Amino acid sequence: NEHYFGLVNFGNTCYCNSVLQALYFCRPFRENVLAYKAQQKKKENLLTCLADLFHSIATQKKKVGVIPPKKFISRLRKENDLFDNYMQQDAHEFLNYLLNTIADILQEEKKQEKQNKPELTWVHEIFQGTLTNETRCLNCETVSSKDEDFLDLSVDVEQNTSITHCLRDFSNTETLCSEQKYYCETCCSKQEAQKRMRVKKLPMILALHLKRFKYMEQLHRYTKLSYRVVFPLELRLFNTSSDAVNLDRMYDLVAVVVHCGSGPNRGHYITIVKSHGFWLLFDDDIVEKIDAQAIEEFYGLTSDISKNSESGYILFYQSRE
């Protein structure tokens, strides 16, 4: 009982469609959304529209087709004036809005039953993780730890690298020096320091965002980074924490949101999802199967000889359940 359906683009809405596809192929999210549909609050909010849409997809007669998500898009425009337009937008910006917006709807719902210390929604149970930022002042050598939550990780990207290496230097100890000296409270002055962000609590789904942009301080404009950045089908992630219990979680690539275009001001968004062993591409209404080798090999770019450079932007890594 599998449903592979395209989504109509109502004028530069690919940034939106592509995220919905990736989110639909993140089963804990899809299952949770479908479950929310069932209760039927019947007060039009972005979450109810999403669930109504995901419900059409899941409860369709034919296994393959096309759905115009008019209803949802209407609500998205009503709910956000920055998305209430025919301009092209960022997929990550949409994802962030959608995920927090639907977490905030649930946060209120959780509170209204208590009506008649904070609580974590099912959006957080799926995508949330925790970091620990350790800061060692190099003069007094006092270390300052600080936990900070995350819904995705915005990793820096380098030419001819891998998603693993980028995650490796994201967690590497950087030196805060010169103009970037740390203000040490015990030293009461600015001193050189070591800054390290390590994973404290692992997310069920690791959402990876690639910082594929370079600002040209002099040229007063930013470019799109179409580097060859390879992503593995599996990811080994290990845990820091209490050290009373240790985790060595193995992740799997479920979806890739990819941005086609040489520049960052205009483009086209598509999604490639892994469903039942084989991979498939979703270009709005068009849904077609793709061979595993042609997936990663086309989401990078060698030299410049690759028309309108399709590059991997958002990556969905699912824990091994």
Binding site: G11, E148, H259, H268
Partner: peptide
Amino acid sequence: KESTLHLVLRLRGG
């Protein structure tokens, strides 16, 4: 104090 904000840019797509 010590909070890390993640600076990020847009990648507009239609």
